[PDB]
């Protein structure tokens, strides 16, 4: 009995950054060194825990969050960062413990003519607290006049889509991001490796 990391890391489709998906994992035996030695990921940063010593440690349950963001945008997925993504789409707490992983996905996510199935929020009335989602698509109100459901001056739609082209630069190249966060609470504390 082993934890199902492969199904998460080899999924056919990935959610949008504004509607990232969550999947808790428990009651299983995990293996992190097989993931570590893949030599195919681009970034592997673990704030607070050494990646080489993950196997010799035990927790209560872990969470897996995944989405797709622009290549130049990966730098905002970190504790204590400032940016439009951190403000409006996905914010990490200051005391975050876990790892962040991201690798290029050009040949799977870029096609001729562009893929418009990935969207990111543009405006929000207030900053996001850590770890919550916002699937609302109500018209934004920039001015001091009610929009009344019509889009125009000072009334903008909150969401637009990325445009991915094979000829785009590596900076605009799509990247797939998977974030693991380890929890610790009074419990049987089942999940941990061999």
């Amino acid at each position, epitope marked *: 009995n082993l934890c199902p990391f492969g199904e998460v890391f080899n999924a056919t489709r990935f959610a949008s950054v504004y509607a990232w998906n969550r999947k808790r994992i428990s009651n299983c035996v995990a293996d992190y060194s097989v993931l570590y030695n893949s030599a195919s990921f681009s970034t592997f940063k673990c704030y607070g825990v050494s990646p080489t010593k993950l196997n010799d440690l035990c927790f209560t349950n872990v969470y897996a969050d995944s989405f797709v963001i622009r290549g130049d945008e990966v730098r905002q997925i970190a504790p204590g960062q400032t940016g439009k993504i951190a403000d409006y789409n996905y914010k990490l707490p200051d005391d975050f413990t876990g790892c962040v992983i991201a690798w290029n996905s050009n040949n799977l996510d870029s096609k001729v003519g562009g893929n418009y199935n990935y969207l990111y929020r*543009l*405006f929000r*009335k207030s900053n996001l607290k850590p770890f919550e989602r916002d699937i609302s698509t109500e018209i934004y109100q*920039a*001015g001091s*006049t009610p929009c009344n459901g019509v889009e125009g001056f*000072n009334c903008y739609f909150p969401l637009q889509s990325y445009g991915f082209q094979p000829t785009n630069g590596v900076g605009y190249q799509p990247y797939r991001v998977v974030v693991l966060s380890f929890e610790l609470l009074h419990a049987p504390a089942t999940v941990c490796g061999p």
Partner: antibody
Amino acid sequence: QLVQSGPEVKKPGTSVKVSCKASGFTFYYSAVQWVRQARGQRLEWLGWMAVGSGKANYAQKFQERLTLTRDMSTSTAYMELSSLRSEDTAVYYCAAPNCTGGSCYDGFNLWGQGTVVTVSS
Amino acid sequence: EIVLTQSPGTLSLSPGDRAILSCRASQTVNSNYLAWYQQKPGQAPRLLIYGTSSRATGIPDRFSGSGSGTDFTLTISRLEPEDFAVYYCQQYGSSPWLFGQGTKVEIKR
């Protein structure tokens, strides 16, 4: 405050590009519209563009010749016109409201200094 | 579309007399997206009234807008030497934001 580029003189059939740099306020939540006026004539509306998402709207006369773009890095708005003719000689303005944060002003109070463009041979 | 026509073309009034303008449209226009601009020869236009009833920042109180529907008016209580210019009315609710033909105010002697 809005600052534009200098005057330019062109040849018929070519294309021109005018930049309208913005500073001193949150440019992310604003929107720019372009108005031109001939010598001693009435103001003429061209179009407008929302800087947040790059969406733009155009009038029917200049639908196939006018292109509006933006640059978030330098907070600069670009306007270009191709296949210029003799009657296109005028001065061009860029206007946008003063945005401080989420809330923003309800009118195009901020205006540029204008750019003189002459088309001739 | 929407067409705007300022009925009084040119008005020559000595300082002191109140002056009026009339910006009338063809179709019903939203009352929250109308404005008036002032332009002097050789300078960029300056915003005076926005929202059909409220004035801009720093505009002296003599200017005052009124009216709704297909009729809109601008009223100057008592003219001043620096208020002789051309005034345009523009609306931006619909897709084409057509301007008006303008009205010129000059000294009478």
